[PDB]
């Protein structure tokens, strides 16, 4: 007689049903422990040091602390740019504004909006969703190719006529919307901006050209980030604060391990070529017999 | 705290709010905004460290009792 | 009323330096203080101290009989 290993594994049965948690105390999960697994026959030990746990919690503190030290460096850049211009901020956004209105209240409302935005920072925010397309696979090559293409010589008539022909007035930003009076900080939203060609200012819109109308309201403020690390803090009245988001205080591998953009792996119902229209999802559901 | 406009003379408006954003609000609604915006917003940890040290003293004196019991 | 069409040369003043100084006071009182990441570290530390306290209590219970 020769009994197979899968027969003993099936007739083994689980010893006991354990259940554990995570660090943040958010997700519990249940773990089996089979008796005839090869985990028993390895003869391994367990050395739970205390300073190893200390350094592990230090590395965990760094891993949580990536985006939050990025947000605090953002806030330092807000205050630094507000000081280095002396507080005489410029207007960079197209909005009809008045003069016969006391602007004493809007500065206090902008400070309160900054404080309430810093009260409600989150992993679903402006700078992280602006950094994720930069963190992609071919974003560096596309960025340097855009750098080489924005810097070209004068168009000679020889290459103008007989040479190959030449080839983006709309940008897809990201925004954090703070509602100061009702105290509802809206965390992360897409927005699409353009240069309104009557003047040299910006206009923001939704996915259907809706012309986002919060900037008329004195109750709200917004933060804009672009995929070229630009920073636009906007209070009502169209006056803005423009700067660059810093990254010198962050590790490269911290940005890699925290929010790296993912590139796809092949599976069923997916085209071998990329950039095509896909078929339906697998969707093994509890509505159908599994056919 | 009044701003410094580049254009000298004020420009009339008839635009519907889809076309452009305006700041037409008077002072009283902004007083309401200030009322609603101004009011809308340790050592005990080291003391608990010291109480944990007092509990260390408590367990070591009860262990002295355990050796002398 | 009557309004102004925007431009890039129309600016807003630093508002008479009585709120800018208060804003720098806000900057210097939020420079050294709560840092918003160690709050969750305090949460997991309180969870750890509680679970180890129940661990020690149940251990000295089952060994004190």
């Amino acid at each position: 007689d020769e009994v197979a290993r899968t027969d003993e594994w099936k007739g083994a049965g689980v010893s006991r049903l354990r259940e554990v948690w995570d660090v943040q105390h958010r997700v519990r999960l249940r773990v089996l422990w089979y008796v005839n697994s090869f985990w028993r026959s390895r003869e391994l030990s367990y050395d739970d040091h205390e300073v190893e746990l200390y350094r592990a919690l230090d590395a965990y503190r760094a891993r949580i602390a990536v985006e939050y030290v990025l947000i605090r460096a953002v806030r330092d850049e807000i205050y630094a740019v507000l000081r280095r211009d002396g507080g005489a901020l410029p207007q960079r956004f197209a909005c009809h504004v008045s003069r016969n209105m006391s602007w004493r209240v809007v500065w206090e409302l902008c400070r309160h909006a900054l404080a309430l935005w810093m009260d409600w920072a989150d992993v679903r925010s402006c700078i992280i969703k602006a950094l994720t397309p930069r963190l992609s696979r071919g974003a560096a090559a596309a960025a340097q190719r855009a750098r080489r293409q924005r810097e070209r010589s004068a168009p000679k008539p020889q290459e103008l006529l007989f040479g190959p022909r030449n080839e983006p007035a709309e940008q897809t930003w990201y925004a954090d919307v703070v509602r100061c009076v009702r105290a509802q900080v809206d965390l992360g939203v897409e927005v699409r901006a353009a240069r309104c060609p009557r003047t040299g200012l910006w206009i923001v819109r939704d996915r259907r050209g809706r012309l986002r109308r919060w900037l008329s309201q004195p109750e709200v403020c917004v933060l804009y980030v672009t995929p070229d690390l630009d920073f636009y803090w906007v209070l009502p009245g169209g006056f803005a604060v423009s700067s660059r988001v810093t990254l010198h205080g962050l590790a490269q591998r911290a940005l890699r391990d925290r929010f790296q953009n993912f590139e796809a792996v092949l599976a069923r119902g997916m085209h071998v070529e990329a950039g095509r229209q896909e078929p339906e999802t697998p969707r093994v559901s509890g509505r159908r017999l599994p056919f | 705290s009044l701003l410094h406009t580049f254009w000298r003379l004020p420009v009339a408006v008839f635009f519907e709010p889809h076309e452009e954003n305006v700041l037409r609000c008077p002072e009283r609604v902004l007083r309401r905004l200030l009322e609603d915006a101004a009011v809308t917003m340790d050592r005990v940890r080291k003391r608990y460290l010291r109480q944990e040290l007092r509990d260390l003293g408590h367990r070591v004196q009860t262990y002295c009792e355990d050796l002398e019991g | 009323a009557v309004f102004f069409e925007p431009h890039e040369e129309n600016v807003l003043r630093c508002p008479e330096r009585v709120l800018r100084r208060l804003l720098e006071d806000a900057a210097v009182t939020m420079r050294g203080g709560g840092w918003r990441e160690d709050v969750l570290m305090d949460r997991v530390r309180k969870r750890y101290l509680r679970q180890e306290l129940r661990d020690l209590g149940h251990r000295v219970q089952t060994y004190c009989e």
Binding site: - | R59, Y63 | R45, E52, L56
Partner: peptide, 20 residues
């Protein structure tokens, strides 16, 4: 007699104090 439980109590208690 009772050296073991209280001695390992000292060890796990000072290990607990390394958390904070």
């Amino acid at each position: 007699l009772r050296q073991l439980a209280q001695s390992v109590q000292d060890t796990i208690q000072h290990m607990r104090f390394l958390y904070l």
